[PDB]
Design a protein around this ligand. Structure first.
Ligand SMILES: [Ca+2]
Length: 223
């Protein structure tokens, strides 16, 4: 997260870190056994880390649980990042508490202008590289589809939306991929892509979660 703020420990209790020997992506806990992330974060041997603030220090509220299964969306296209969504099932149920809590799925899609909360452990610079140890947060509005499409001509599908600031300076970034965009208490986006980070006229592009609720519900009911 570029141009954000320090969230405060466990104030984003649905945020998870995906670890394969190192933090490499974020995710969102949607019930005690399931995490939503980005398909482009797929790899084998994922450990899910819940209840994290400082990802480099054990502070006492963490739960580390191995994934038993990963399910990439059946229409995910890695070239265009259309349908950039994946479900991860935990080997055992998380203990839900004040520091580890699920986020609701949307019943309806979010509106342009709604201020959302984006979070993660990704790069904090727009030029250069600095990875934080504690969780960072950004409030960012959903942009109109016309402005989104204008920013990325020929690349925006109906399963994507743009959030952020056309003037630049505030954005999600590498290492925040797969993490949450929460609007009005619902998971409405997944950190997906963008041209660099916090660049002028290049806002963040997010997976539009409300298009996937049927697939999520069906998948979870059968796995
Ligand atoms: Ca920790």
């Amino acid at each position: 997260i570029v141009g954000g703020y320090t969230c405060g420990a466990n104030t984003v209790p649905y945020q998870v870190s995906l670890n394969s020997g190192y933090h490499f992506c974020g995710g969102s806990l949607i019930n005690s056994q399931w995490v939503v992330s980005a398909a482009h974060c797929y790899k084998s041997g994922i450990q899910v880390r819940l209840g994290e603030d400082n990802i480099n220090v054990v502070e006492g509220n963490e739960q580390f649980i191995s994934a038993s299964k990963s399910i990439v969306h059946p229409s995910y296209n890695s070239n265009t990042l259309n349908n950039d969504i994946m479900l991860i099932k935990l080997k055992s149920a998380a203990s839900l508490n004040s520091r580890v809590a699920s986020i609701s799925l949307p019943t309806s899609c979010a509106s342009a202008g709604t201020q959302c909360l984006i979070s993660g452990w990704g790069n904090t610079k727009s030029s250069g590289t600095s990875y934080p140890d504690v969780l960072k947060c950004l409030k960012a509005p959903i942009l109109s589809d016309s402005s989104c499409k204008s920013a990325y001509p020929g690349q925006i599908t109906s399963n994507m939306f743009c959030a952020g600031y056309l003037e630049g300076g505030k954005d999600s970034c590498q290492g925040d991929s797969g993490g949450p965009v929460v609007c009005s208490g619902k998971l409405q986006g997944i950190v997906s892509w963008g041209s660099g980070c916090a660049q002028k006229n290049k806002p963040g592009v997010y997976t539009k979660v409300c298009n996937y609720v049927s697939w999520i519900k069906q998948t979870i009911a059968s796995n």
